[PDB]
Design a protein around this ligand. Structure first.
Ligand SMILES: [Cl-]
Ligand SMILES: [Cl-]
Length: 57
């Protein structure tokens, strides 16, 4: 599945909720996937094993 959360601009991480716990994973350093805006929605995609801290709004 895909798991949603919020990104930290300070740390360039995504904190996502999965099975009742929070998990923190680095965002990519790629320009249009990194955490550009603090607390932007982010997702960990467990099908692709990928993270995006600029999920489509
Ligand atoms: Cl937790
Ligand atoms: Cl910000």
């Amino acid at each position: 599945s895909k798991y949603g959360g919020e990104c930290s601009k300070k740390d360039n991480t995504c904190t996502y909720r999965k099975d009742g716990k929070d998990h923190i994973v680095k965002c990519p350093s790629a320009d249009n996937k990194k955490c550009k805006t603090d607390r932007h929605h982010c997702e960990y995609d467990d099908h692709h094993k990928t993270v995006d801290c600029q999920t489509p709004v």
